[PDB]
Each structure stands twice: as structure tokens, then as C-alpha cells.
Amino acid sequence: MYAVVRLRGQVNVRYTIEDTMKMLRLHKVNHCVFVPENPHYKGMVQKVKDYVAYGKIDAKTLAEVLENRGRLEGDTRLTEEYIRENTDYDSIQAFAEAVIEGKSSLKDIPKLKPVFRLHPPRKGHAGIKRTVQQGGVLGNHDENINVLLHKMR
Amino acid sequence: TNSHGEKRCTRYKLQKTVRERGISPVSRAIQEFEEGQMVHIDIDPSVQKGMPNPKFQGSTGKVIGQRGRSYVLEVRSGNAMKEVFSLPQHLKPQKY
Amino acid sequence: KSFIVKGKFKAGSTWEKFTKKIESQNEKNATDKTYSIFGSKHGVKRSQVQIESVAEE
Amino acid sequence: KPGSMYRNVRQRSFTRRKYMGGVPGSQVIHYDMGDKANTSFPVKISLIVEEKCQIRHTALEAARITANRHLVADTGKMGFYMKLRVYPHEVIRENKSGMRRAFGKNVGTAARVKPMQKIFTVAVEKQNFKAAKEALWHAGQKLPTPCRIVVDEGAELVQ
RNA sequence: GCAGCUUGCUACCUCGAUGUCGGUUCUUUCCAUCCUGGCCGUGCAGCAGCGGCCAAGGGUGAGGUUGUUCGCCUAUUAAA
RNA sequence: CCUGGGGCGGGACGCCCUUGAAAAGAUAUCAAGGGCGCGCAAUGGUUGACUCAAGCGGGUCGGAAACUCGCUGAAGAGUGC
RNA sequence: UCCGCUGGUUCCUUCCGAAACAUGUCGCAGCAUGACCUGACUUGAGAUCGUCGGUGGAGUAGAGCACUGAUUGGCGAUUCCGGGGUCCCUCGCUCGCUUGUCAAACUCCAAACCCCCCGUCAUCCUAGAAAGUCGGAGUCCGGACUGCUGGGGUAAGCUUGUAGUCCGUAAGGGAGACAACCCAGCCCGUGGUUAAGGUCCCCAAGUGUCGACUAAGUGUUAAUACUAAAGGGCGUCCCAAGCCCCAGACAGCUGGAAGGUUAAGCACUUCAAAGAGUGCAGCUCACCAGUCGAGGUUUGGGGCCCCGAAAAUUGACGGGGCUCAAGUCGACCACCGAUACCACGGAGUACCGCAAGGUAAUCUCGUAGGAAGGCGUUG
RNA sequence: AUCAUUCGCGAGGAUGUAGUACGAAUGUCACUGCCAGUGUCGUAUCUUACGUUUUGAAGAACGGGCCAGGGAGUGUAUCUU
Ligand SMILES: [Mg+2]
Ligand SMILES: [Mg+2]
Ligand SMILES: [Mg+2]
Ligand SMILES: [Mg+2]
Ligand SMILES: [Mg+2]
Ligand SMILES: [Mg+2]
Ligand SMILES: [Mg+2]
Ligand SMILES: [Mg+2]
């Protein structure tokens, strides 16, 4: 499961890349979306590598992301009670485990927004002018996206 | 000044490869096409009759009718739909 | 706490071997000092420096 | 007209001489010097250029003259074989008024050379290696590019 | 390669005007130094040259033609 | 009228092809190569029969210049410009 | 009078928001038509700005000589068409084998982008897809940055194109100032954290950490119209490889350059140790012996610095100043720092709902201009 | 913050203390008589006027010395929505 977070703005960005972002539902910086691992989404995330950061999120990171930055319709925070009344699992942690194990989805939750408006990264990040392999933050973090997601908790 | 003729800038659009120059395969000229079938426009430069523009070279046309030997194609040129008359020698079916 | 470092690096348009004897507190610090010294003496980043081994001596 | 004018490569290749008019030919006379028969020279070195530059035919002729004279005075007339690999194929045209109808007349030819492309190849004996190398050094001083010598044959024969 | 001190190229500023050449007057500036000061080389005997380096404190004038700039010519002058 | 100010020069003032033009399309300059303002009752249509350019070989002053026979020959010819 | 030419054209808010381009024009300071913007209406279910796979178009970069043309030698024959001192024989073209270069009007080859169509995912869509009809225009002086070695040009803050994004019409934060360079697209107030960039002082936060380099005040200048080259350096710091090398080299200190030749040196039988000879006929090196007693020399590839390096009012790393740095290089840590992001409260807008009200990550910038709603004077 | 453990060459990081004490704001109880505002001055940050021609205006481009009043989409006919 790619965890794609936007880290650069929409100024001086080409229309194809900006529409790629818009179909990914990433209109502003510090916005995260969780998407499956099919080749279609892999190509879409590859097209916007210079303006986002993506990786393979683990279950604990997604659990804390749902617990601290999940919003329903009307801008209402997600909690444990809504999860238990609209899913089969014991808490947000078990639902995150199910989502990582592929037998669940984020669309299982009724009314849940597909965009996680995250906080800016605590103690900054590595920079938006170099990729991950150049010492920056853009591009593919692999499993190290969870460190960046943790610092943007 | 430059010209505005129909064959303008078709040095390689309307050129045949070295080992397909000469007579073409005659089976390409009797390929019947159905209504609504998608066919590729790949112009045969040897057949000088019933040819579309070079500007439609490489466009997929939907067959909508027949006008004798040639076929009626609904071709797309940028943002407009065009009706392009082409004989079967210049068309080629799309395979799935 | 002395080390031998083997490898090659991009000395301009070419690649050159090296077995520069480097000493430090441990092996990772030896590798870091290898990268730092080559970035100093030749102005090349760590992508242009390849270390084949770090031999404890 | 200094070589800095027709030096940088920012234009496409103007070489089809059947669609142009009256190119003044190159002053470069020969392209082989020395022993043109002895293929048994063990130590062979080449002068390579390390930029993308257009060498005028007059520059090539001056470099060839200085290198050939140095090699003849160093290793004798038949103790070396020196090859100028590149022909000047590009036609250099100057806008000889103002900028109206600016496509100029051909005022000479030149050779467009890529980075690391050998200009002169010199084959010499073991003892005449240093003289050939130094003459090739003098040859590159008459060229508009930074040039470095590279050894073709007998790298172990020298060191 | 440098300078932007000649002619070009360009059309960025100015056409509800930035008074357009040359001279004169007065002040200043750069050194790529003509003389004055200090050195180095010489195919420097001396005298007098020739070439180069440092150096902008001072000096660098008077006259004939030409509207001239420039340039020529005259006699001085350390140099003009 | 266009015009690296205007004028002199030129017509990039109508039509046609190659490049420019960055492998769909489009793409400017007084950009580069240029051409056209016609010719033909056959230099047109169709059917049949053949294959051309240029070499090598044989043939008598018919020379290394003619015409003729064999071989090579997907085109190196011809198709008005 | 007329003018396509100049100047001026008077209140507020809200919604949306361009074009400086094509064709024709006695057309080039103008206009019409189309693209682009806006408002309304009809229509009734798909649309493609994006991804992945496939059926097709490639003839550009690159590459190459297989065609068209160029282009360099060598080797062996055109017994022939040709040039020269019994056509005795010289002999350049021409044809093959092996080399050396090319093309914008060359291609046996040949990408990455890209374009048409199909399937899938994705997004938009009955709160109205694509299509259609009508009302209103503005607009056809554009410019810049990043690419295309774009074309031309000696080059140009030159001129003329193309793809994207900007300024125009773009705030706020930062580069010293900066139309268009980076963050950023922005309703109001508060709190927090970050972006770009910076942390010696001017100035909030580092006289921060590790490993080296620079000795020149070099530098303290991302992009750039704002930044000097060729050439050279036994300046200094590195990597690698030949050669001599504790069976004793390199550089210094002791006996000789004695046989020879005056082949007028400077126009050997055989010895470890003496030439047809380095130097101001003795005056001097190359060379063997001894000697301190250990590295020496050559080449190649690199980093920084230096010479090359001269301009005009006194002056510009932004200034002070800075030398194991306050400079350069390879990494790292912590903090500072926006109106961005998060949160809270509030305003406006869009659509839906009978209404209460609901939704908005997928609403809030704005020139020419379209549309809507209001304030004011006189009657 | 402090303290403890551990890692890190080091600057520092991780873990726990602790999502604790705090924290915009929303209420309530004391306490106090000034506060909002107005004029001027100073300190800190930001801004080179307005309209126009302009690709680009603070321009060494054009307009205004200042103040008051006057000063620019109106009617007929016709066509269209
Ligand atoms: Mg005119
Ligand atoms: Mg090419
Ligand atoms: Mg930009
Ligand atoms: Mg804009
Ligand atoms: Mg700004
Ligand atoms: Mg408006
Ligand atoms: Mg304007
Ligand atoms: Mg009034």
C-alpha cells in the first residue's frame, strides 16, 4: 500500500502532472492518500515523484494515521466507536491490520474522507529540491515513509 | 514561400520501405470491413487512387458506410470528427 | 582501530583504485572518513566513491 | 577573422555542398605523414579533444605543419607515422547592409569534433615516444580546444 | 583574450525636445607612462640608444593652414 | 503594402515540392534549395507483346562513334517540365 | 466636418475571468471571421486532463555507409577511355581488399517523448457527460524563465519559432535591492509547526559536530542579460603505475677522466675507473671505488589556489569583518523562519434541501471583459 | 523542562517520566476604575505616490501648484435577442 504524501505546491507545475495529482486527490501540501499497489497506481505515483513522497506503509503507521487524522463527512474526527459500529474489528489498530493484510479497505468505513490532511513534519524534513536518493525527501522512501509519516503525525 | 498542396511534407509519410516497394499484397485490397469496425489508416503510396490525406496517416477510423470500392471512416483530427474516404488498400484492421 | 579501505572512484572522467590506510574508532566511522576524505581531496560526492571492503587491521 | 568566431557548436551541420554555392576549399594539404607503409609501430599515441568544437581548416593545417615539422626534426623523416583523422566537412559561412538577408556566404570549411574524439594518431618506435608526444603537445596549441594525449598501443612498452 | 576610448550590429530608454560638432574656460579621473624618479637585460666600452618591469606626485607648452576632431608643418622643449 | 526605421535593391504580394520543423498534427523570419503562369490529336484511352540504364564477350575500314547476338542487370532507365 | 491618431470617461460588493494567436483585408497603429472568456436555454449518459497493457503511425536524437552526394591513405589489377620524354616502356583516372572521416534537403538501422483506437484503473458526472442554439464582449504592440546543439547571426538585455510554466493580471516569505529566480498561489482574527533560505554581528536561530582542503582576503555570487579565457605552475593535498632501492640508489664529501688522436677535440689485445668530447693547453661533467645510511626519480588522472589579470567621481562578499573559518568539498545534528500546512472561532460564495439546514482536500488571487446584488443625488 | 536508561566518534537521537504540567478559546468567582476612541511623538516590521501610455513606471515617459463648483454612453428610425 503506497502512502503518497504531497510535499510541493501547485505553482509552476505542468498540467499533466497537476491533473495526475488531482486524480490522486492531493491538492495541497502535507496531504496523504492511501492507494493500492496495482500497476496503474504505480505509474500514476511514478509520474508525480518530484512533487510527492511515497512508500510502503506498515500497519502501525496507518493505525496512528487513522486515529489522529481521520475525518468523516462534515469534518468530524474518526474514533474507536465509529469504527466498531461500522466495521467488524476491535479498534482502529485491528482495522489497520486488516487493511495492510489486504482483506479490508479504507472504503469499508462509511463516509470516510480519502484524504488525510496531515500536520507539517515535526523537526522539518530533508528538502523538496532533492529526491530520497539524493538526500532530499521527494520520491520513494520505501518503508522509510513511515518515519516521515510519524514526524507528520 | 512554402506551398499549401495536399502532398506537402509527405516525403516519408508517403514513402514505401525498400523491401515493400513495388506491387503490394493484393489480399490487402479486398479486405471487407464491417459496420462500426475500427480500422487503421496506413496509406499505401503505390495505390495512388482513393487515398486520404497524409494528415490522417496513423489515425484509427470507425467504418460507418461504403461508397463503392472505398469505405467511409469517422476519423479524429485533433478535436474534430472527419469523414475520410479510403479504399481498402489503405486501411488495415485493428486486432484485439 | 586502524583500517584498510579498498575500492575505486571517479577521478575526473576515469576511475582509479585505492587502498588508503584509514584509522578511526570503528568500521563505520572508517567508511565515513573514507567518503569524507575523498569528497575533500577530489570534490566527488559519495555516489562517485565505491568501497569494495573495509578490512580491520 | 579569429577562430573564436567559428568555434562554438550551436548550429546544425552545413555540409551538403550541392545545395550551397562556392565553398573556398581547405588549406589542409595532407592527412598522412611519415612512413605510410610500416604498420609495425609498437607505441601509438593519439591527440584527443575534450570539448565540442569546430576546428577550422587553417587551424588543422597549422597544427599538422607544426606536428609534422617537430616529428621530422625529432624522429627523422621515416621514423614516424602521423594521421590527421578528421576532414573539415562543415562549411563556415559569414554574413559579410545589417541583419537583413543575413544568410552569409561560405568563407571556409571546418571539422566538427566531439568530446574525446581523436584528432591526430601517431605511431612511433619505443625511443621516439617522448618526441612524438611533445610534438603532439605542440600540435594541440594551435587548436581551439583543450587537448590531452592518450596512448593507443604499447601502454606497457612505456611504463 | 582584455578595453569599450573608431566604425559597425541592435532597437531596450527618451519624439507634450535630455539644445546637436570643434574651440575656449575650469575641475577631476584611469594607466595601457611621453618626460621627471627606481630597476632589469643587451648583440650595454663611455656618450647615446634599444626592449621590459615598478611608479599617476608634478609636467605635457607657443605658433602657420584648415570650422575642424584627426593629421601635417615650424621653432623651442626634460617631454612637448 | 511588406521591409531588423524609411528609401535604393528585392517580392519571401497568387500557386507547387524538399529541409527548417524538435519521428502525430501545427509552426515564423528579406530562412535555405527552387519551380510555376506552360506544352501535347498525341507526348491521350484501352488491349496485346515485350523490358530498360550501364557493363563484359562475338561480329568486316560499320574504329575505342552507329547496327546486331549472348550473359549480368528490382531499375542503377523511362514516365513532357 | 472627418480621422483607424492623442487625452479623458464620475459609486460599493459578489460570482466567473481572458487574448496579445490563425485566415482575409490598399492589410500591418484598424477591422471581420475563428480560437480563448462570460450569461442563459435545450438536450438527456456518458467524458478523458492521468496511469498500466495491447493493436497501429513513426523516420527525429543516436548510429551507420545499405542508396544519394562528399572524404583519407596503403595494397593488387583497370593490359582497354587517358597524361608524358617499333605508339619499345613512363603512367593519372577506374575497379576490388584493408584503413580514416561526414551530411540540414542521405538511410540497411533506429529510440525516449508523442498521436489515433481498444481494454483496465483513476477522476468528473442525473446537484447534469458529450453535443446544440442564442445574448455580451474583450483580443490580433506582448514579454520572460527552463528545454529543443531550435533557424539566422561574430555576438547581443539581438531577431524569429516551438513545449511547459510564469509576468501581464500575482499577494505573503527569501535571495541587498530583483515584473516574470525558490517556497507559495491569498477571505478575517488567534495559536502552533514547517516550506524556501539562514543561524559570528548588522538580524530570530550554531563562534554547531565529524573528516579534509585553501594562504590567495582567493572566496564569503543557486538560476541568471548580474560570474574572464587559452596556456603554465619542482604552490600545496591525493590516487595509480614503471624505473633504481639497506647484495647500500638519490643529493653532498675524497683518488682518476691516465691507452688514445693533431681522425688541428669547443668554424685500443684488455683494465671496476679515459670520448673522435659537457665547460671558463692545463681550468669542467657523463662515468667505476669509498662515504653518511634511506628513500629517490619519471609518467598519468584528480581537488583547491596562483601567474596569465590594465579604466577612467571614493565603494561595494549587501556592510562590518572572517584564516583547523564567519571560505571550499563529503556528510550530519539541533534550531530559526511565511497569510503555506494543522486547529479553533468568524465572513462570503457554489450547489442541494419545502424549511431548519447539509456538503466543499476536491470553494475563496486577479487586468481587458461578461453576469448578479446593493449605496447615493434630484424629481 | 528536570531526572533515569541506552545508543552515537561527536553535535545529538530513541525510550520512559508524558501525550503529563502547559496550551487559543469557552464559562464562572473574586479584584480593580479604567477602557474603546481621538491628536502628536517614539520604538520594531513592511511599503520608491496616483491615473495613463506601456511587454515592463518611483521613473531622468506623459498629466496635475492648491481648493471649490461645472465636466463625458443621450434621442429618433430600423434590425436582432
Ligand atoms: Mg511602409
Ligand atoms: Mg545526427
Ligand atoms: Mg518560471
Ligand atoms: Mg498567472
Ligand atoms: Mg515576490
Ligand atoms: Mg473587470
Ligand atoms: Mg496593458
Ligand atoms: Mg463636482
C-alpha distances out from residue D88 to A60, A80, A106, D123, Å = 68, 80, 68, 23
DSSP for A105-150 reads -GGGSTT--S-EEPPPPTT--S-SSSBTTTTSSBEEEETTHHHHHH
**Which cell numbers hold the place of B19?**
523491401
Alpha helices in D9-148 (DSSP H): 57-75, 129-140
CA distance D124 to D35: 10
Q: Which chains touch B (3 or more CB pairs under 8 A)?
A: none
Q: What is the CA radius of gyration of chain C?
A: 11
CA distance A101 to A105: 10
CA distance A103 to A97: 9
Strand-pair category, A139-142 with A52-55: parallel
Which of the nucleotides in strand G have any atom less than 7 Å away from a protein CB atom?
A: 49-60, 69-75, 100-109, 114-118, 120-123, 149-156, 158, 164-166, 181-185, 192-197, 210-213, 230-232, 237-242, 298-304, 328-332, 334-337, 340-344, 358-362
Please provide the distance, in angstroms rounded to a whole number, between the alpha carbons at the two ends of chain D: 43
**Which cell numbers hold the place of D1?**
577573422
CA of B9 to the centre of ligand 6 (A): 45
Which residues are within 7 Å of strand H by their Cβ atom?
A: A 153; C 25-26, 28-29, 32
CA atoms within 13 A of residue B15's CA, in its CB half-sphere: 7
CA of D50 to the centre of ligand 2 (A): 19
C-alpha distances out from residue D62 to A95, B87, D131, Å = 81, 64, 18
In degrees rounded to 5, what are phi and psi of residue A54?
A: -135, 155
Please tell me the experimental approach by which this structure was elucidated: cryo-EM
